[PDB]
Amino acid sequence: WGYGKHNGPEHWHKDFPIAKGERQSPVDIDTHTAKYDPSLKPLSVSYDQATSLRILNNGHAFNVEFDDSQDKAVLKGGPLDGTYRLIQFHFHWGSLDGQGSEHTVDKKKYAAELHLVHWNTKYGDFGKAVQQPDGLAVLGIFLKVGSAKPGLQKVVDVLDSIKTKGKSADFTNFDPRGLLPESLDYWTYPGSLTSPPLLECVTWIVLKEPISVSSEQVLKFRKLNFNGEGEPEELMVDNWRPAQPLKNRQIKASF
């Protein structure tokens, strides 16, 4: 699987039948049909103690991994029950500024989308979490092209070193707090991972307010390669999946 014409999203169903499931992600967020739920609590992001470890190019994207052996960086509150530990963050981006995000707002697409993945720590490890309907929580953040995002530059600068598939680099002392918008208002719905295995284990929490990044910052994302070293060069662009059918699910809003 990849994002090209021969192994693209439209083909994932063949190897991952769940591709056509009942709670697939991403979806279109219709702001007028979204339900304000007053019973929804404020999100609690505790990332002061986050321990970034490394950055790796896995052939589909670049992942920043965190030490999740203790409740170091956690997410709680909102629509969630119990604690969820940050394990990794990654982005989805387009070849042009008019596309890149997974989720859309009133059919509007952003230049990129940041996903902060967390797993429910009553399941003990990530692998068990993926076997539960409430095993995972992803914080989704939209990226729009405008002014540079200072807290994003350390990531941009190490990309050169993980240009092709399978490369990794030490990446410690990176604070994820530097990627958050001012406002924590969000939308939430039950979905799934947006790339195979597409497991339907996720509680989505898509933030209303996008963060802005510079054109030059998004340009370096686009210098990455899907391919391994010594292979014909295929630029890592458009690694996003098209919106899926809501199918009776209800999207709730905290505002």
List active site positions.
Answer: 60
Shortest-Cβ-distance residue relative to Zn ion: 115
Query: Which of residues 78 and 100 has its CB atom nearest to Zn ion in the complex?
Result: 100
From 63-71, 109-117, 156-164, 241-249, give the range in contact with Zn ion by CB under 5 A: 109-117
Q: Which residues contact 106 (CB under 8 A, 6 or more apart)?
A: 28, 29, 30, 31
User: Running DSSP on this structure, what letter comes out for residue 107?
Assistant: T
What are all long-range contacts of 1-7, with beta carbons under 8 Å and residues at least 24 apart? Answer: 1/195, 1/196, 2/59, 2/60, 2/226, 3/60, 3/226, 3/238, 3/239, 3/240, 4/234
**CB of residue 200 vs Hg ion: minimum separation in angstroms?**
5
Binding site for Hg ion (CB under 5 A): 199, 201
**CB of residue 222 vs Hg ion: minimum separation in angstroms?**
32
Element (H, E) at 57: strand 52-57
User: Is residue 118 within the footprint of Zn ion (CB under 5 A)?
Assistant: no
- Amino acid, res. 59: G
- Amino acid, res. 93: W
From 100, 145, 141, 153, select the one nearest 117 (Cα to Cα).
141
**CB of residue 192 vs Zn ion: minimum separation in angstroms?**
11
Query: Which of residues 137 and 201 has its CB atom nearest to Hg ion in the complex?
Result: 201
Q: Which region holds residue 95: left if phi is over 0, alpha if psi is between -120 and 50, else beta? A: alpha
User: Is residue 109 within the footprint of Zn ion (CB under 5 A)?
Assistant: no
The Cα–Cα gap between 48 and 11 comes to 41
143 binds, among Hg ion, Zn ion, none (CB under 5 to 8 A by kind): none
Calculate the CA dihedral of residues 10, 242, 116, 207 and round it to 10 degrees.
Answer: -160
User: Is residue 115 within the footprint of Zn ion (CB under 5 A)?
Assistant: yes
**CB of residue 228 vs Zn ion: minimum separation in angstroms?**
21
CA angle 189, 193, 194 (to 5 degrees): 100
**CB of residue 139 vs Zn ion: minimum separation in angstroms?**
11
User: Which ranges constitute the DSSP H helices of the chain?
Assistant: 12-15, 126-129, 153-158, 215-221
Query: Which of residues 145 and 199 has its CB atom nearest to Hg ion in the complex?
Result: 199
From 21-29, 31-39, 115-123, 231-239, give the range in contact with Zn ion by CB under 5 A: 115-123
115 binds, among Hg ion, Zn ion, none (CB under 5 to 8 A by kind): Zn ion
Query: Which of residues 84 and 171 has its CB atom nearest to Hg ion in the complex?
Result: 84
How many residues contact Zn ion, by CB under 5 A?
1
Query: Which of residues 42 and 242 has its CB atom nearest to Zn ion in the complex?
Result: 242
201 binds, among Zn ion, Hg ion, none (CB under 5 to 8 A by kind): Hg ion
Per CB under 5 A, residues contacting Zn ion are 115
